[PDB]
Curated annotation (Swiss-Prot):
The chain holds residues 1 to 75 of 128 of the full protein. It is found in: Cytoplasm; Nucleus. Changing S65G: Phosphomimetic mutant that can recruit PRKN to mitochondria. It comes from Homo sapiens (Human). The record marks R54, R72 as: Interacts with activating enzyme. Changing R74K: No effect on ADP-ribosylation. Exists either covalently attached to another protein, or free (unanchored). When covalently bound, it is conjugated to target proteins via an isopeptide bond either as a monomer (monoubiquitin), a polymer linked via different Lys residues of the ubiquitin (polyubiquitin chains) or a linear polymer linked via the initiator Met of the ubiquitin (linear polyubiquitin chains). The modification Phosphoserine is found at S65. Changing R72G: No effect on ADP-ribosylation. This is Ubiquitin. Phosphorylated at Ser-65 by PINK1 during mitophagy. Phosphorylated ubiquitin specifically binds and activates parkin (PRKN), triggering mitophagy. Phosphorylation does not affect E1-mediated E2 charging of ubiquitin but affects discharging of E2 enzymes to form polyubiquitin chains. It also affects deubiquitination by deubiquitinase enzymes such as USP30. The modification (Microbial infection) ADP-ribosylthreonine is found at T66.
Protein backbone atom coordinates (compact mmCIF):
# COMPACT_ATOMS: atom_id res chain seq x y z
CA UNK A 1 0.00 0.00 0.00
CA UNK A 2 1.13 3.60 -0.52
CA UNK A 3 0.27 6.48 1.81
CA UNK A 4 1.14 10.17 1.82
CA UNK A 5 2.78 12.20 4.57
CA UNK A 6 2.45 15.99 4.38
CA UNK A 7 5.69 17.57 5.62
CA UNK A 8 6.40 20.91 7.27
CA UNK A 9 7.07 22.73 3.98
CA UNK A 10 3.72 21.64 2.57
CA UNK A 11 5.50 19.08 0.40
CA UNK A 12 4.43 15.45 0.46
CA UNK A 13 6.38 12.22 0.75
CA UNK A 14 5.04 8.80 -0.23
CA UNK A 15 5.63 5.71 1.89
CA UNK A 16 5.26 2.01 1.13
CA UNK A 17 3.43 0.44 4.06
CA UNK A 18 1.13 -2.45 4.95
CA UNK A 19 -2.11 -2.15 6.92
CA UNK A 20 -0.50 -4.15 9.75
CA UNK A 21 2.30 -1.59 10.23
CA UNK A 22 2.29 0.29 13.53
CA UNK A 23 2.39 4.07 13.75
CA UNK A 24 5.87 3.63 15.26
CA UNK A 25 6.90 1.77 12.10
CA UNK A 26 5.68 4.70 10.01
CA UNK A 27 7.63 7.10 12.22
CA UNK A 28 10.73 4.98 11.61
CA UNK A 29 10.15 5.26 7.87
CA UNK A 30 9.79 9.03 8.20
CA UNK A 31 13.04 9.09 10.21
CA UNK A 32 14.73 7.14 7.40
CA UNK A 33 13.64 9.75 4.86
CA UNK A 34 13.64 12.99 6.86
CA UNK A 35 16.02 12.35 9.77
CA UNK A 36 13.47 13.51 12.36
CA UNK A 37 13.52 11.16 15.36
CA UNK A 38 10.25 9.41 16.30
CA UNK A 39 10.04 11.27 19.64
CA UNK A 40 9.87 14.58 17.75
CA UNK A 41 7.12 13.32 15.42
CA UNK A 42 3.39 13.47 15.85
CA UNK A 43 1.20 12.08 13.08
CA UNK A 44 -2.30 13.46 12.54
CA UNK A 45 -5.11 11.73 10.63
CA UNK A 46 -8.88 12.27 10.82
CA UNK A 47 -8.50 15.05 13.36
CA UNK A 48 -6.51 13.08 15.89
CA UNK A 49 -2.97 12.25 16.86
CA UNK A 50 -2.05 8.63 16.22
CA UNK A 51 -0.79 6.25 18.93
CA UNK A 52 2.58 4.55 18.37
CA UNK A 53 1.43 1.03 19.18
CA UNK A 54 -1.66 0.99 16.96
CA UNK A 55 -1.77 -0.08 13.31
CA UNK A 56 -2.69 1.73 10.11
CA UNK A 57 -5.68 -0.63 9.83
CA UNK A 58 -6.83 0.37 13.33
CA UNK A 59 -7.18 3.94 12.12
CA UNK A 60 -8.66 3.05 8.71
CA UNK A 61 -5.65 4.48 6.92
CA UNK A 62 -6.09 3.45 3.27
CA UNK A 63 -4.32 3.71 -0.07
CA UNK A 64 -3.45 7.36 -0.76
CA UNK A 65 -4.60 8.50 2.68
CA UNK A 66 -2.68 11.59 3.81
CA UNK A 67 -1.12 11.82 7.29
CA UNK A 68 0.11 15.21 8.49
CA UNK A 69 3.53 15.32 10.08
CA UNK A 70 3.77 17.61 13.10
CA UNK A 71 7.06 18.50 14.80
CA UNK A 72 7.18 18.47 18.58
CA UNK A 73 10.57 20.18 18.97
CA UNK A 74 10.89 19.44 22.71
CA UNK A 75 10.82 15.73 21.88
Amino acid sequence: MQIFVKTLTGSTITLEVEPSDTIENVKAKIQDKEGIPPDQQRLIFAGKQLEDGRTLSDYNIQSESTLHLVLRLRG
